[PDB]
């Protein structure tokens, strides 16, 4: 299934920026980093449970948040850009 | 129609934080700031065109980017959080 991962972390600190690097390291195994903290990923349901599980341990859950959008097929024909 | 807007800007400088707030002020007219630089928007075709126009002026096109994902209806049945 396609999954868009949007990670909200405060990059004004070294530790923030380091968690971003880890989250990115993890998500790019499963697809592509299209902005600094946005990822277009391709995962089986087992992989998705595994990813959730590892993301939990990387992120600071009190300050950070991750959202997952499950778009269908023809999701590429449904993205537009600027910049 | 529902559109997800994701804005990539560097917020370690005042100039980036300004641009983000300005994008925020615009996008919040049409939906919600679900995370610091992500906005879930509800828009007519005409609203979508005018917004795209103004975002274009606001952002630094060389160092920033905006992605608009058109969410299908019942897109809410397909969002999860950790």
Q: What is the CATH number of the domain that holds A36?
A: 3.30.70.240
Distance, in Å, from the CA atom of A26 to the CA atom of B27, rounded to the nearest integer, reads 30
Q: Is B8 annotated as a binding residue?
A: yes
Chain B residue at shortest CA distance from A55: B82
Chain A residue at shortest CA distance from B68: A80
Task: Quote the domain boundaries for residue B76.
Answer: 1-82
Distance, in Å, from the CA atom of A4 to the CA atom of B11, rounded to the nearest integer, reads 22
Q: How far is CA B26 from CA B33, B42, B64, B71, in A?
A: 11, 13, 16, 20
Distance, in Å, from the CA atom of B22 to the CA atom of B19, rounded to the nearest integer, reads 5
Contacts 24+ apart (CB under 8 A), A47-53: A48/A1, A48/A3, A51/A26, A51/A27, A52/B82
Q: What is the 3-state secondary structure (H, E, C) of chain A?
A: CEEEEEEECCCCCHHHHHHHHHHHHHHCCCEEEEECCEEEEECCHHHHHHHHHHHHHHCCCCCCEEEEECCCCCCHHHEEEEC
The residues pairing with B8 across neighbouring beta strands, listed in sequence order, are B65
Q: How many domains does chain B have?
A: 1
DSSP-derived secondary structure letter, B15: H
From chain A, pick out residues whose CB is under 8 angstroms from the CB of B56.
82
Distance in Å from the first CA to the final CA of chain B: 26
- The answer to whether residue A57 neighbours chain B at the CB level (below 8 Å) is no
């Amino acid at each position: 299934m396609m999954v868009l991962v949007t990670y909200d972390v405060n990059t004004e600190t070294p530790a923030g920026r380091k968690r971003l690097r880890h989250v990115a390291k993890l998500c790019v195994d499963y697809g592509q980093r299209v902005q600094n903290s946005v990822f277009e990923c391709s995962v089986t349901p087992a992989e998705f449970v595994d990813i959730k599980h590892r993301l939990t341990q990387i992120i600071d859950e009190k300050t950070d948040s991750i959202r997952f959008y499950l778009l269908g097929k023809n999701w590429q024909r449904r993205v537009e850009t600027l910049g």
